[PDB]
Amino acid sequence: ARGMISDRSGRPLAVSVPVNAVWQGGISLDTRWKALSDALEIPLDQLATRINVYLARQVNPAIGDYIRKLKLPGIHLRQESRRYYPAGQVMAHIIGVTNIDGQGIEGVEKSFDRWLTGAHNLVLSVDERLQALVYRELNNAVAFNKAESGTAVLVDVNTGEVLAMANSPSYNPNNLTGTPKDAMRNRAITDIFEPGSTVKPMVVMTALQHGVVKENSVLNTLPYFVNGHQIKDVARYAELSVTGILQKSSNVGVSKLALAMPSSALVDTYSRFGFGKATNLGLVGESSGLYPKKQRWSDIERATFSFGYGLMVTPLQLARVYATIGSMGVYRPLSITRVDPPVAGERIFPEPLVRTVVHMMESVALPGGGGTKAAIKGYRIAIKTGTAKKVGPDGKYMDRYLAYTAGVAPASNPRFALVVVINDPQAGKGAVSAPVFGAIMGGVLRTMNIEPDALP
């Protein structure tokens, strides 16, 4: 009896349904052998030849009981355990699947194969109710945009629990027929990409802590050169405040903040928030991303590092980063299992310093920002849109237009960190993923009965 997997509210996600196994050595050529062939989908020639020892496995008991009451020569029925997944496609990648011998091969089924056999029940951090809402919005968004793929990871800022982890496309764990191997991969923990503009909140933090800038400081944001490379934003601005730099996603802005500090400044802050550090769930293929081990930093390299290039992250790794932003500089480990609060957290940045940067990040959601489509009605949100051009498992990167939105809500007192990723949207008519974050985060906020924190 393999253990029952449940969500945080005790709803069933994986249960063991019972299923049969079917196994004077000449075929009597009675009427029963034909009725056997019709039942097991096994021709007389094939049936006779394959035994001239298993015949059929993972067979419906109803058929199984119809076979017993033929009473054929030394036919023996063995008891097996097919896994039934009520959610199915919705949480295919988290739950995973089991093999024919009831051995964990993918998802938590493999991660907790020991506990679920050697057996008691598993209570996950995931909320089916949220996962369902997260998955639907993502699946619809990928289809609407005509995108190849899409990923959404939802983390609790306070507990570090994974509330949802939807991937599109998904697979049917109840029937694994006609689905490729590439579809099985959990793209939320395996596929890595250059984090890009999503690191710029961390740049502003470092610059504030290193005293390079005050929270009301204004910078010369005209285009300039570093080692014969022009640092320029598409949207050209004369002057921007530290707020404006995040608002407008000013490469010129962050590059000057970065080059005002030592090379090691960002390398430290990034590592503190958990860039290039193992997510440390049991899941197969879980990637720790890529991170510089280098020694000599050129001026251009220090600048491109502030733009969010020269390192790579899983959607889950980035969700943990923004979880640490929502907690106001408290780095908690990720949990796929339900946990009783309070969860012990390590402080990596001063509380009042991070809080001001979270307030600056609301301007991205507000008018003039690059993330206005992500705006929730009644809720203040602290988000950051970004873009990358290649994404895949380590050594298997494919050149795709990767659009994503990392954010935290509600801004007044954050409860959730969300990361949405739309992969290679082949659309016409960052700006692609901004709305998905909106629908998802908005739905999560109203579902958990959070109060709107919009101004009078």
UniProtKB/TrEMBL annotation:
It catalyses: Preferential cleavage: (Ac)2-L-Lys-D-Ala-|-D-Ala. Also transpeptidation of peptidyl-alanyl moieties that are N-acyl substituents of D-alanine. It is an enzyme of class 3 (hydrolase). Gene3D superfamilies: 1.10.150.770, 3.30.450.330, DD-peptidase/beta-lactamase superfamily, Penicillin-binding protein 2a (Domain 2). Pathway: Cell wall biogenesis; peptidoglycan biosynthesis. Residues 150-441 form the Penicillin-binding protein transpeptidase domain. This is Peptidoglycan D,D-transpeptidase FtsI. Residues 1-118 form the Penicillin-binding protein dimerisation domain. It is a single-pass membrane protein. It comes from the Bacteria. Keywords: Carboxypeptidase, Cell cycle, Cell division, Cell inner membrane, Cell membrane, Cell shape, Cell wall biogenesis/degradation, Hydrolase, Membrane, Peptidoglycan synthesis, Protease, Septation, Transmembrane, Transmembrane helix. One of its GO terms (cellular component) is plasma membrane. It holds the Pfam family Transpeptidase. Belongs to the transpeptidase family. FtsI subfamily. PANTHER family: PEPTIDOGLYCAN D,D-TRANSPEPTIDASE, PEPTIDOGLYCAN D,D-TRANSPEPTIDASE FTSI. It is found in: Cell inner membrane. The active site is at S197 (acyl-ester intermediate). GO terms for molecular function: penicillin binding; peptidoglycan glycosyltransferase activity; serine-type D-Ala-D-Ala carboxypeptidase activity. Its EC number is 3.4.16.4. Catalyzes cross-linking of the peptidoglycan cell wall at the division septum. InterPro entries: Beta-lactam/transpept, Beta-lactam/transpept-like, FtsI_transpept, PBP_dimer, PBP_dimer_sf, PCN-bd_Tpept. The keyword Zinc does not apply. GO terms for biological process: cell wall organization; division septum assembly; FtsZ-dependent cytokinesis; peptidoglycan biosynthetic process; proteolysis; regulation of cell shape.
